[model samples]
Target: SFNANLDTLYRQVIMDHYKNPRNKGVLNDSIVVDMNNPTCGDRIRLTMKLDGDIVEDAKFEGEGCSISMASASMMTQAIKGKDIETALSMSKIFSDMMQGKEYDDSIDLGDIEALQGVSKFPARIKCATLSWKALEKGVAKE
Candidate 1:
């Protein structure tokens, strides 16, 4: 029952993010990165505002499956206020995890951990990583 309970909780959280996403909008002044998964038709425009090396704010406007939108919501929440280097590192960690590669577990993943279940479904990996890839690209241009 414990695993069942956890799975149910994870589903609820993912749906919550999908239904009521955080930071879903365009920014007046920010670096924008548009990314799409052609196979799934998931398109996302990630907007980020950086102050020095720190991520002052982050947001996303896109249309996609629950996994994509929910991941975007979780990513924006995680990266805000983090240093560029950390955000990039987190993106790397997340990418590796989605690919089922070994990833560092010391750093807390917060709600992002709820997405671990996504790794089991190979077809959906790209959907889950769309937003994080956008974040990496946006930060790289800085």
Candidate 2:
């Protein structure tokens, strides 16, 4: 089935990110936020360096399922040079994307789109969003 192949492609992208994460190490930046999902035994630590309102750099450290860790890596990659406003906007879209909605087709998600299928699996939503929550907390806390 062609549609089956599409889901498989999404799976491969998700697995590839899980096994080969992009931003694995933390940069020990000024704003740090850590979160844990006891429901799934996942934990994430987000470290970010901000230049005024812009995210000059961002990285993360975490232990979790592929969904959580992979999403964490992608989150760090997307927000590296973004300002808080845009980053948060992306986050909101991502949340909506995970809520069983279609993606903003004109918007580019890069590798982050790999997790698009995650919305179908409600059990894994927390695993996917833990790092994003950390990103939101890190910014909103300050």
Candidate 3:
């Protein structure tokens, strides 16, 4: 038996992101990637514009629990205007956080760090990482 405080998982910033996400739209200069986790009805259309190995812009439209939507919201906000390699690395770190694996916190995770507690909930791990996995697949080099 154990006690897990959701307060740690769902912070004000995370909720705020879910309520009002940043960059929540597609732009003319964007590379859109649509991805989802059908098991939980969580889907995201991530639109990004890469500017010289950086993520010039990022946003997501999705429906799911606070964790999923919040992750997308926080992710888009954090990666925006960052270099592509950094964005990709951030995705990897975020995925590791969701799975309770080791991650490099050398760079700031921003509000998304609040979700570190989600690792405790085995069921929701997939929900949190859906977007990152999609990002990996979509951003694959040609």
The Cα local distance difference test for each model comes to 0.90, 0.85, 0.77
Q: Candidate 3, residue 27: CA error in Å?
A: 2.0
Q: Work out how many backbone clashes candidate 2 has.
A: 0
The stretch of ten residues in a row with the least summed lDDT in candidate 3 is 1-10
| Model 2, TM vs. native | 0.93
Give a tens-digit lDDT track for model 2, residues 45-137: 888889999999887888998899989988888888888988888888899899978657555467788888889899999998998899999
After superposition, candidate 1 runs with Cα above 4 Å error = none
Model 2, stretches more than 4 Å misplaced? none
Per-model TM-score versus the true fold: 0.93, 0.93, 0.85
* Best of the two (2, 3) by TM-score: 2
Q: lDDT score, residue 142, model 2? A: 66
Q: Rank the candidates by lDDT, best first.
A: 1, 2, 3
Q: Top lDDT: which candidate number? A: 1
lDDT, residue 59, model 1 = 83
Q: Note the residue pairs that clash in candidate 1.
A: none
Those runs of model 3 whose alpha carbons end farther than 4 Å from true positions after fitting are 1-10
Error of 2 at 88 (Å): 0.4
| Order by TM-score, highest first | 1, 2, 3
